[PDB]
Design a protein around this nucleic acid. Structure first.
Ligand SMILES: [K+]
Ligand SMILES: [Mg+2]
Ligand SMILES: [Mg+2]
Ligand SMILES: [Mg+2]
Ligand SMILES: [Mg+2]
Ligand SMILES: [Mg+2]
Ligand SMILES: [Mg+2]
Ligand SMILES: [Mg+2]
Ligand SMILES: [Mg+2]
Ligand SMILES: [Mg+2]
Ligand SMILES: [Mg+2]
Ligand SMILES: [Mg+2]
Ligand SMILES: [Mg+2]
Ligand SMILES: [Mg+2]
Ligand SMILES: [Mg+2]
Ligand SMILES: [Mg+2]
Ligand SMILES: [Mg+2]
Ligand SMILES: [Mg+2]
Ligand SMILES: [Mg+2]
Ligand SMILES: [Mg+2]
Ligand SMILES: [Mg+2]
Ligand SMILES: [Mg+2]
Ligand SMILES: [Mg+2]
Ligand SMILES: [Mg+2]
Ligand SMILES: [Mg+2]
Ligand SMILES: [Mg+2]
Ligand SMILES: [Mg+2]
Ligand SMILES: [Mg+2]
Ligand SMILES: [Mg+2]
Ligand SMILES: [Mg+2]
Ligand SMILES: [Mg+2]
Ligand SMILES: [Mg+2]
Ligand SMILES: [Mg+2]
Ligand SMILES: [Mg+2]
Ligand SMILES: [Mg+2]
Ligand SMILES: [Mg+2]
Ligand SMILES: [Mg+2]
Ligand SMILES: [Mg+2]
Ligand SMILES: [Mg+2]
Ligand SMILES: [Mg+2]
Ligand SMILES: [Mg+2]
Ligand SMILES: [Mg+2]
Ligand SMILES: [Mg+2]
Ligand SMILES: [Mg+2]
Ligand SMILES: [Mg+2]
Ligand SMILES: [Mg+2]
Ligand SMILES: [Mg+2]
Ligand SMILES: [Mg+2]
Ligand SMILES: [Mg+2]
Ligand SMILES: [Mg+2]
Ligand SMILES: [Mg+2]
Ligand SMILES: [Mg+2]
Ligand SMILES: [Mg+2]
Ligand SMILES: [Mg+2]
Ligand SMILES: [Mg+2]
Ligand SMILES: [Mg+2]
Ligand SMILES: [Mg+2]
Ligand SMILES: [Mg+2]
Ligand SMILES: [Mg+2]
Ligand SMILES: [Mg+2]
Ligand SMILES: [Mg+2]
Ligand SMILES: [Mg+2]
Ligand SMILES: [Mg+2]
Ligand SMILES: [Mg+2]
Ligand SMILES: [Mg+2]
Ligand SMILES: [Mg+2]
Ligand SMILES: [Mg+2]
Ligand SMILES: [Mg+2]
Ligand SMILES: [Mg+2]
Ligand SMILES: [Mg+2]
Ligand SMILES: [Mg+2]
Ligand SMILES: [Mg+2]
Ligand SMILES: [Mg+2]
Ligand SMILES: [Mg+2]
Ligand SMILES: [Mg+2]
Ligand SMILES: [Mg+2]
Ligand SMILES: [Mg+2]
Ligand SMILES: [Mg+2]
Ligand SMILES: [Mg+2]
Ligand SMILES: [Mg+2]
Ligand SMILES: [Mg+2]
Ligand SMILES: [Mg+2]
Ligand SMILES: [Mg+2]
Ligand SMILES: [Mg+2]
Ligand SMILES: [Mg+2]
Ligand SMILES: [Mg+2]
Ligand SMILES: [Mg+2]
Ligand SMILES: [Mg+2]
Ligand SMILES: [Mg+2]
Ligand SMILES: [Mg+2]
Ligand SMILES: [Mg+2]
Ligand SMILES: [Mg+2]
Ligand SMILES: [Mg+2]
Ligand SMILES: [Mg+2]
Ligand SMILES: [Mg+2]
Ligand SMILES: [Mg+2]
Ligand SMILES: [Mg+2]
Ligand SMILES: [Mg+2]
Ligand SMILES: [Mg+2]
Ligand SMILES: [Mg+2]
Ligand SMILES: [Mg+2]
Ligand SMILES: [Mg+2]
Ligand SMILES: [Mg+2]
Ligand SMILES: [Mg+2]
Ligand SMILES: [Mg+2]
Ligand SMILES: [Mg+2]
Ligand SMILES: [Mg+2]
Ligand SMILES: [Mg+2]
Ligand SMILES: [Mg+2]
Ligand SMILES: [Mg+2]
Ligand SMILES: [Mg+2]
Ligand SMILES: [Mg+2]
Ligand SMILES: [Mg+2]
Ligand SMILES: [Mg+2]
Ligand SMILES: [Mg+2]
Ligand SMILES: [Mg+2]
Ligand SMILES: [Mg+2]
Ligand SMILES: [Mg+2]
Ligand SMILES: [Mg+2]
Ligand SMILES: [Mg+2]
Ligand SMILES: [Mg+2]
Ligand SMILES: [Mg+2]
Ligand SMILES: [Mg+2]
Ligand SMILES: [Mg+2]
Ligand SMILES: [Mg+2]
Ligand SMILES: [Mg+2]
Ligand SMILES: [Mg+2]
Ligand SMILES: [Mg+2]
Ligand SMILES: [Mg+2]
Ligand SMILES: [Mg+2]
Ligand SMILES: [Mg+2]
Ligand SMILES: [Mg+2]
Ligand SMILES: [Mg+2]
Ligand SMILES: [Mg+2]
Ligand SMILES: [Mg+2]
Ligand SMILES: [Mg+2]
Ligand SMILES: [Mg+2]
Ligand SMILES: [Mg+2]
Ligand SMILES: [Mg+2]
Ligand SMILES: [Mg+2]
Ligand SMILES: [Mg+2]
Ligand SMILES: [Mg+2]
Ligand SMILES: [Mg+2]
Ligand SMILES: [Mg+2]
Ligand SMILES: [Mg+2]
Ligand SMILES: [Mg+2]
Ligand SMILES: [Mg+2]
Ligand SMILES: [Mg+2]
Ligand SMILES: [Mg+2]
Ligand SMILES: [Mg+2]
Ligand SMILES: [Mg+2]
Ligand SMILES: [Mg+2]
Ligand SMILES: [Mg+2]
Ligand SMILES: [Mg+2]
Ligand SMILES: [Mg+2]
Ligand SMILES: [Mg+2]
Ligand SMILES: [Mg+2]
Ligand SMILES: [Mg+2]
Ligand SMILES: [Mg+2]
Ligand SMILES: [Mg+2]
Ligand SMILES: [Mg+2]
Ligand SMILES: [Mg+2]
Ligand SMILES: [Mg+2]
Ligand SMILES: [Mg+2]
Ligand SMILES: [Mg+2]
Ligand SMILES: [Mg+2]
Ligand SMILES: [Mg+2]
Ligand SMILES: [Mg+2]
Ligand SMILES: [Mg+2]
Ligand SMILES: [Mg+2]
Ligand SMILES: [Mg+2]
Ligand SMILES: [Mg+2]
Ligand SMILES: [Mg+2]
Ligand SMILES: [Mg+2]
Ligand SMILES: [Mg+2]
Ligand SMILES: [Mg+2]
Ligand SMILES: [Mg+2]
Ligand SMILES: [Mg+2]
Ligand SMILES: [Mg+2]
Ligand SMILES: [Mg+2]
Ligand SMILES: [Mg+2]
Ligand SMILES: [Mg+2]
Ligand SMILES: [Mg+2]
Ligand SMILES: [Mg+2]
Ligand SMILES: [Mg+2]
Ligand SMILES: [Mg+2]
Ligand SMILES: [Mg+2]
Ligand SMILES: [Mg+2]
Ligand SMILES: [Mg+2]
Ligand SMILES: [Mg+2]
Ligand SMILES: [Mg+2]
Ligand SMILES: [Mg+2]
Ligand SMILES: [Mg+2]
Ligand SMILES: [Mg+2]
Ligand SMILES: [Mg+2]
Ligand SMILES: [Mg+2]
Ligand SMILES: [Mg+2]
Ligand SMILES: [Mg+2]
Ligand SMILES: [Mg+2]
Ligand SMILES: [Mg+2]
Ligand SMILES: [Mg+2]
Ligand SMILES: [Mg+2]
Ligand SMILES: [Mg+2]
Ligand SMILES: [Mg+2]
Ligand SMILES: [Mg+2]
Ligand SMILES: [Mg+2]
Ligand SMILES: [Mg+2]
Ligand SMILES: [Mg+2]
Ligand SMILES: [Mg+2]
Ligand SMILES: [Zn+2]
Lengths: 118, 204, 131, 59, 16, 122
RNA sequence: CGAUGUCGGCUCGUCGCAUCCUGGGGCUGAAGAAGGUCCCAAGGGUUGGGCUGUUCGCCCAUUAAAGCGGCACGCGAGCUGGGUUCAGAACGUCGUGAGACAGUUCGGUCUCUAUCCGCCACGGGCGCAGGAGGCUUGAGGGGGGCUCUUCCUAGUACGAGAGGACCGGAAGGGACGCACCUCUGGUUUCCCAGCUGUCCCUCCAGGGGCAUAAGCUGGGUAGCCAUGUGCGGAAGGGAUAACCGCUGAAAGCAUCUAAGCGGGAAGCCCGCCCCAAGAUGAGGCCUCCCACGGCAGCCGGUAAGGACCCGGGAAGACCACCCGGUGGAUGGGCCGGGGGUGUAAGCGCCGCGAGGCGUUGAGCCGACCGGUCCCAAUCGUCCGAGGUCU
RNA sequence: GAAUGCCGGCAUGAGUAACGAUAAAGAGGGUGAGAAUCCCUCUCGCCGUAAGCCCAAGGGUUCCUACGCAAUGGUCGUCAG
RNA sequence: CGUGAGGGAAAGGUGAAAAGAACCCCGGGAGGGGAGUGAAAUAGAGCCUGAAACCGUGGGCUUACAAGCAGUCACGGCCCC
């Protein structure tokens, strides 16, 4: 049973799943768009959207919060300076996931892109 | 033999005469009768009841014909109450008064493929003293050459829950017509937001 | 439909607003209605609140005291009509929301560990000045 | 355990009757409104790079 | 319940 | 929640200090006894020259439990030990005193004498 | 004998009845209560512990009772391996000896993969002469079936007394079962906090990794849960068993019977809950579709409708089932509430300092109850009747 | 036609068990007919009285470079003992 | 294979003649389709003949209320001559 439980396990133990979401966000907040597996893609939506929302608030507390996951002072700066402001009026939904048409060769995994919204 | 359709909403406890009473709230009314079954036409006596409004877009054509013949707005579920004839065209909570004693049918929580210990309360195996990869196993399932087969009905693992369960003889603690609310004492099958059926009890 | 709303509605007729607020660590006197033979009376229970479970109307609090050499804990539903009044006899200061740990301390250690919350004391005296 | 083992070789008929459920179902495809090419629904067209009536991705 | 103990008729099996 | 093997402090001046339950007297197979239930127990430890000595097989009523007990008013109550008071086959106490509070459930179950002897009923 | 694994235990039971208890009786050397003894009855029930490898037995404490047997002395491709069949070693005894002993002692390898039948669950297919969406009837199955105490009747009938009822009526329990999470009590793998060593970011402050597959410690929502909560055993109707009759011959009397009619069990049939029309004997009702083309038939396009695909779900191994797909609140984000944690960072003040106070119930914040089209369920495709004959 | 016969071929079990330490991965860029699996970068994790380094035995060209991918590599391969 | 003494295999066939398939086509290659050689190419080198087990495609008949050492005897239906 799993009744009303939220959030995938992704066949990773606790701390590895965590590093996964961080490294994804790092990659995403860097290139603005990445490709991953669909389940990985759906889980990233929330994790980054939360960080982006904290950049929108701009205070010191927010930066130190975000910096716990992202770790890179430059990248945080980018998030706070470049990324965030172009979402001031956007209330949630700062990311999108769209599904790709071709599976991977070596394991047939369904791929998708995840990107930051305009 | 009166009955009504409803939804399970959640439990709490109220206070009545320095006593705490666990209750379950059910949203029951109102339910429009949309067909009646008679001994002439159908062989028996019932009242087909409808419940919860439906987006008429989502109701197909064979169904649209059925409601219109009743003079009735489209509805999410149809269910019958057997041996029941309310005079009105609509049934509400007003048919049960506090103190009345009722039966409720719900669809039980589903435990999926359940082990033998959860489903049938077997004892499993010992947990040390040499117990070997059998700690939750059923044990013997038979004899030897006689009869040399397994009985029908033998309790084994398999799906559990998500099945029709009726709990009987519950006390009606209160009814709130202004909200179509029904307060029954005790526990009702199924998850919150679940469909239920509430009948007058068959208990004396 | 709003299922949570319906619940709180049923519940609402029993909700009390008349009782004082209090925090775990505080010392409190709960005047509880009790029945025996053949009468009903008011029996006081006075101790530290060591826990506060919150579930809206179903919030319950737990109070602990030593009576004639034995430790006693009492659990009360906060909106129980059987409670007449609750009197804050002292404000205490925990750094912790559940205080199970005092079960294993001496009367001395407890006094050290739960110092008077002087802030909420001035605060209690700031009110108690009526117009 | 005691090493269960098959008692009889399975008949050609019975192995093939087990396979009576093994047929693949053809992939489900729809034309893409821009380049008319056949593609999986709800996916970005991998031929012309369009999904939801706008160019999304460089093919 | 047979009152006279009955001999084993097979050894406990060994790797042999 | 008292069952066979469970030790209990005795809350009286009978002379026993600790008794160990060996049987709960509530039907053919009751699993646990609680406040107001009569148990049968052995005396595991006693003071010099009591009305009882180590080794006796006595009866006692449970007066305090460490598993909390629930009440019809929606409250509960719980004590720090499990204690009992030794009795005779007439449900009367055997000692002349009882120590510490006892549960009000005792009154309802007809252990009147004990309740008056108790310093406090909670 | 080109192998039918062997005591006891555990686990899971199912059956017999020559019945341990609970139900119905006859006789009694049956006053009452309580027994004795035989008859009917297999529905349910039949406890925990000490000793011993034990089955058995004895004992302790209870009990309505602590029933006896069958199923390869049921059950080792289900577990144990204490008993007992190997090799080591010792004691008593036998033998010159090697060695031996229904004599004893300590130790001694128990095999991941189920093909077929069978069983528990779940689908796919075809069928149920038009094709469809709903709602159902119940043939036939299964589940269940226990019982104690106290009180009133009444300290009455009965008895010298001790004691102590039938019938009837209330209340409270034990074990078992189903469901549930409001309370009580668990878990709650990252929801919060505290703490150590070390390496790091970025020097201070502030943080991050690692110490488990949570480093440790104090807590903990939803969910899943029991120790917690509700409810169930029935009631009632019918037919009977033993047993008791009514009327009554044969057989002028007598007879429960040969004709006929009563009473009578926890048992039987029904009633209660669950499954069920593959019930091929394929049922019924309501409603929608339509008599289209080319050649009881085939082919093509459609109708009602359905599937595919997608967002999901206290549904779930896959499958299925249920909800939703922009005409939209399905998930995700975001806002509000709940809920947990228990006063963040930063700054100001106090102290030489570890720290302390205020700002501040602050900051953070899974799942819960809601709101909101910010993100994503785009766009679509394929199936799918034209109704056999008296 | 049988000898649990001999040699060979091909079935069944079955698209099943398994794919050899639970130290762990993610993304971007490149190459190419083809890439989860080769190269490059960044991030994350693991060993560190070693899972680093140097000798002796044993092995005997496995070393370096270019060009390759039928087979060997438990998948893949453009990589490689 | 075995430390060694020692043990100890499997494996023959294009065609008369290489005339061993230029060249084009799909393909990274393998492989194939044409062209060509030959009396013959299911003689194409994984090559005389090419049996059987075994796997596949296509066609007729048949099968989803049926109880089986799988055949046989009878009858009827459908398909072929
Ligand atoms: K022997
Ligand atoms: Mg489930
Ligand atoms: Mg689990
Ligand atoms: Mg959800
Ligand atoms: Mg997580
Ligand atoms: Mg999940
Ligand atoms: Mg995996
Ligand atoms: Mg992994
Ligand atoms: Mg984990
Ligand atoms: Mg870790
Ligand atoms: Mg890790
Ligand atoms: Mg998409
Ligand atoms: Mg690959
Ligand atoms: Mg796809
Ligand atoms: Mg239902
Ligand atoms: Mg189990
Ligand atoms: Mg169960
Ligand atoms: Mg259980
Ligand atoms: Mg067990
Ligand atoms: Mg054991
Ligand atoms: Mg266990
Ligand atoms: Mg073992
Ligand atoms: Mg083993
Ligand atoms: Mg184990
Ligand atoms: Mg056996
Ligand atoms: Mg066996
Ligand atoms: Mg048989
Ligand atoms: Mg199910
Ligand atoms: Mg009321
Ligand atoms: Mg629920
Ligand atoms: Mg709620
Ligand atoms: Mg409302
Ligand atoms: Mg008092
Ligand atoms: Mg075995
Ligand atoms: Mg096995
Ligand atoms: Mg094993
Ligand atoms: Mg095996
Ligand atoms: Mg076999
Ligand atoms: Mg075959
Ligand atoms: Mg075949
Ligand atoms: Mg098969
Ligand atoms: Mg002694
Ligand atoms: Mg033999
Ligand atoms: Mg054999
Ligand atoms: Mg054999
Ligand atoms: Mg054999
Ligand atoms: Mg054998
Ligand atoms: Mg008999
Ligand atoms: Mg009797
Ligand atoms: Mg008598
Ligand atoms: Mg007498
Ligand atoms: Mg008798
Ligand atoms: Mg008799
Ligand atoms: Mg019986
Ligand atoms: Mg039986
Ligand atoms: Mg029996
Ligand atoms: Mg013992
Ligand atoms: Mg024993
Ligand atoms: Mg014994
Ligand atoms: Mg022993
Ligand atoms: Mg013996
Ligand atoms: Mg008796
Ligand atoms: Mg016994
Ligand atoms: Mg038996
Ligand atoms: Mg036997
Ligand atoms: Mg046996
Ligand atoms: Mg056996
Ligand atoms: Mg074994
Ligand atoms: Mg055995
Ligand atoms: Mg065997
Ligand atoms: Mg066997
Ligand atoms: Mg087993
Ligand atoms: Mg042994
Ligand atoms: Mg012995
Ligand atoms: Mg031995
Ligand atoms: Mg030996
Ligand atoms: Mg010896
Ligand atoms: Mg000797
Ligand atoms: Mg001699
Ligand atoms: Mg001698
Ligand atoms: Mg001999
Ligand atoms: Mg001898
Ligand atoms: Mg011998
Ligand atoms: Mg002897
Ligand atoms: Mg000896
Ligand atoms: Mg031994
Ligand atoms: Mg040893
Ligand atoms: Mg083993
Ligand atoms: Mg297998
Ligand atoms: Mg099988
Ligand atoms: Mg078979
Ligand atoms: Mg089916
Ligand atoms: Mg199907
Ligand atoms: Mg009918
Ligand atoms: Mg049948
Ligand atoms: Mg029936
Ligand atoms: Mg039945
Ligand atoms: Mg009386
Ligand atoms: Mg009862
Ligand atoms: Mg809750
Ligand atoms: Mg809880
Ligand atoms: Mg609670
Ligand atoms: Mg709790
Ligand atoms: Mg965290
Ligand atoms: Mg941590
Ligand atoms: Mg650190
Ligand atoms: Mg620092
Ligand atoms: Mg590190
Ligand atoms: Mg490390
Ligand atoms: Mg680690
Ligand atoms: Mg806890
Ligand atoms: Mg914890
Ligand atoms: Mg929780
Ligand atoms: Mg329980
Ligand atoms: Mg009856
Ligand atoms: Mg009768
Ligand atoms: Mg007579
Ligand atoms: Mg007469
Ligand atoms: Mg005569
Ligand atoms: Mg007659
Ligand atoms: Mg009769
Ligand atoms: Mg009769
Ligand atoms: Mg009579
Ligand atoms: Mg009964
Ligand atoms: Mg049904
Ligand atoms: Mg049908
Ligand atoms: Mg049906
Ligand atoms: Mg039939
Ligand atoms: Mg039908
Ligand atoms: Mg799903
Ligand atoms: Mg739909
Ligand atoms: Mg659509
Ligand atoms: Mg649309
Ligand atoms: Mg939404
Ligand atoms: Mg939402
Ligand atoms: Mg809140
Ligand atoms: Mg709060
Ligand atoms: Mg502060
Ligand atoms: Mg601060
Ligand atoms: Mg200073
Ligand atoms: Mg909040
Ligand atoms: Mg959130
Ligand atoms: Mg709206
Ligand atoms: Mg399209
Ligand atoms: Mg022959
Ligand atoms: Mg062989
Ligand atoms: Mg063989
Ligand atoms: Mg054989
Ligand atoms: Mg051979
Ligand atoms: Mg041969
Ligand atoms: Mg051979
Ligand atoms: Mg061979
Ligand atoms: Mg094969
Ligand atoms: Mg498979
Ligand atoms: Mg298999
Ligand atoms: Mg498998
Ligand atoms: Mg292997
Ligand atoms: Mg596998
Ligand atoms: Mg590996
Ligand atoms: Mg591995
Ligand atoms: Mg490990
Ligand atoms: Mg890459
Ligand atoms: Mg790339
Ligand atoms: Mg690759
Ligand atoms: Mg590749
Ligand atoms: Mg590389
Ligand atoms: Mg070191
Ligand atoms: Mg060398
Ligand atoms: Mg070598
Ligand atoms: Mg070489
Ligand atoms: Mg070199
Ligand atoms: Mg080289
Ligand atoms: Mg190299
Ligand atoms: Mg190279
Ligand atoms: Mg290769
Ligand atoms: Mg290749
Ligand atoms: Mg080559
Ligand atoms: Mg290879
Ligand atoms: Mg390979
Ligand atoms: Mg390998
Ligand atoms: Mg390759
Ligand atoms: Mg290459
Ligand atoms: Mg290599
Ligand atoms: Mg050798
Ligand atoms: Mg060699
Ligand atoms: Mg040799
Ligand atoms: Mg040769
Ligand atoms: Mg030649
Ligand atoms: Mg030649
Ligand atoms: Mg070419
Ligand atoms: Mg090419
Ligand atoms: Mg070529
Ligand atoms: Mg070709
Ligand atoms: Mg060619
Ligand atoms: Mg030619
Ligand atoms: Mg010729
Ligand atoms: Mg030829
Ligand atoms: Mg030839
Ligand atoms: Mg060949
Ligand atoms: Mg020749
Ligand atoms: Mg040839
Ligand atoms: Mg050939
Ligand atoms: Mg052939
Ligand atoms: Mg064929
Ligand atoms: Mg039939
Ligand atoms: Mg047929
Ligand atoms: Mg037959
Ligand atoms: Mg004939
Ligand atoms: Mg013929
Ligand atoms: Zn396109």
């Amino acid at each position: 049973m799993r009744h009303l439980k939220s959030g995938r396990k992704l066949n990773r133990h606790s701390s590895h799943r965590l590093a996964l979401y961080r490294n994804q966000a790092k990659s995403l907040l860097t290139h603005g768009r990445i490709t991953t597996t669909v389940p990985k893609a759906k889980e990233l939506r929330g994790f980054v959207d939360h960080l982006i929302h904290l950049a929108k608030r701009g205070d010191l507390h927010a930066r130190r919060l975000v910096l716990r996951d992202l770790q890179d002072v430059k990248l945080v700066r980018k998030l706070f300076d470049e990324i965030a402001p172009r979402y001031r009026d956007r209330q949630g939904g700062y990311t999108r996931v769209l599904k790709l048409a071709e599976r991977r060769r070596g394991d047939g995994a369904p791929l998708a892109l995840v990107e930051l919204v305009e | 033999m009166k009955g009504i359709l409803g939804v399970k909403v959640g439990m709490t406890r109220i206070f009545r005469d320095d006593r705490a009473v666990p209750v379950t709230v059910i949203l029951a009314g109102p339910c429009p009768v949309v067909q009646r079954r008679t001994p002439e036409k159908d062989g028996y006596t019932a009242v087909q009841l409808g419940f919860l409004p439906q987006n008429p877009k989502r109701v197909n054509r064979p169904l649209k014909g059925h409601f219109a013949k009743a003079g009735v707005e489209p509805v999410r579920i149809l269910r019958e109450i057997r041996d029941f004839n309310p005079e009105g065209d609509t049934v509400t909570v007003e048919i049960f008064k506090p103190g009345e004693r009722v039966d409720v049918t719900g669809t039980s929580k589903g435990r999926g493929f359940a082990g033998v210990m959860k489903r049938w309360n077997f004892a499993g195996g010992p947990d040390s003293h040499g117990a070997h990869k059998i700690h939750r196993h059923p044990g013997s399932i038979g004899n030897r050459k006689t009869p040399g087969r397994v009985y029908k009905g033998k309790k084994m693992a398999g799906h559990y829950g998500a099945e029709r369960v009726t709990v009987m003889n519950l006390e009606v603690v209160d009814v709130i017509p202004e909200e179509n609310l029904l307060l029954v004492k005790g526990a009702v099958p199924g998850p919150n937001g679940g469909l239920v059926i509430v009948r007058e009890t068959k208990k004396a | 439909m709003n299922r949570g709303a319906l619940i709180k509605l049923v519940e609402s007729r029993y909700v009390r607003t008349d009782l004082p607020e209090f925090r775990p660590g505080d010392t409190v006197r709960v005047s509880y209605k009790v029945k025996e033979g053949n009468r009903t009376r008011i029996q006081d229970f006075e101790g530290i609140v060591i826990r506060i479970r919150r579930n809206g109307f179903n919030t319950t609090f737990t109070v602990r005291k030593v009576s004639y050499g034995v430790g006693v804990e009492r659990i009360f539903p906060l909106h129980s009509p059987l409670i007449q009044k609750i009197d804050i006899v002292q404000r205490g200061r925990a750094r912790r929301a559940k205080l199970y740990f005092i079960r294993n301390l001496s009367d001395r250690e407890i006094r050290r560990k739960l110092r008077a919350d002087r802030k909420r004391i001035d605060q209690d005296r700031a009110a108690e000045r009526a117009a | 355990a005691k090493h269960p083992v098959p008692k009889k070789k399975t008949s050609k008929a019975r192995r093939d009757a087990r396979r009576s459920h093994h047929a693949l179902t053809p992939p489900t495809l729809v034309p893409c409104p821009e380049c008319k090419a056949m593609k999986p629904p709800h996916t970005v067209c991998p031929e012309c790079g369009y999904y939801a009536g706008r160019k999304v991705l460089e093919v | 319940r047979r009152i006279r103990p009955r001999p084993p008729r097979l050894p406990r099996p060994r790797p042999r | 929640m008292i069952q066979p093997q469970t030790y209990l402090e005795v809350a009286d001046n009978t002379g026993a200090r600790k008794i160990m339950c060996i049987r709960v007297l509530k039907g053919s197979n009751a699993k646990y006894a609680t406040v107001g239930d009569v148990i049968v127990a052995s005396v595991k430890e006693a003071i010099p020259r009591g009305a009882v000595k180590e080794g006796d097989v006595v009866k006692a009523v449970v007066v305090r439990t460490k598993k909390e007990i629930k009440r019809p008013d929606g409250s509960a109550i719980r004590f720090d030990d499990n204690a009992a008071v030794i009795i005779n086959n007439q449900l009367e106490p055997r000692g002349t005193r009882v120590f510490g509070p006892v549960a009000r459930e005792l009154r309802e179950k007809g252990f009147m004498k004990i309740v008056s002897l108790a310093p406090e009923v909670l």
